[PDB]
Amino acid sequence: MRGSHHHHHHGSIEGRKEGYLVSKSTGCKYECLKLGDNDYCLRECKQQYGKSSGGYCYAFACWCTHLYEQAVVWPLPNKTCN
């Protein structure tokens, strides 16, 4: 009846800032059809990162909020992923 002594933090790069839902598997992200007419941005940021993490259909593309430090985004202009 003891333990529960662990940690899930790697790096002192504090930020807790929003970011794309782009993963490492594929490596890309296509802007949804309508601007706020779907939940593809949330469902993608539900199991991936967490439940508390949400997201909407921003102007550019699926902009997720409340992301951890592990979350990875696609640092690129308004073009197709490399």
Hey, what are 3's tokens? 């333990």
16-68 CATH choice from 2.40.160.40, 3.20.20.140, 3.30.30.10, 3.40.50.800: 3.30.30.10
Residue the block writes with tokens 């985004």:
73
End-to-end Cα distance, the chain: 50
H or E, element range at 19: strand 19-20
C-alpha angle with apex 46: 35 to 43, nearest 5 degrees? 40
Distance between CA 64 and CA 61 in Å, rounded? 9
Q: Which experimental approach was used here?
A: NMR
Distance between CA 74 and CA 82 in Å, rounded? 10
**Could you tell me which residues come within 8 angstroms of residue 54 by beta carbon, excluding any fewer than 6 positions away?**
42, 45, 64, 65, 66
- Give the burial class of 53: count Cβ atoms within 10 A of its Cβ; 0-12 exposed, 13-18 middle, 19 or more buried: buried
Q: Which of 63, 59, 61 is nearest to 80 (CA)?
A: 61
- CB–CB of 67/18 below 8 Å? yes
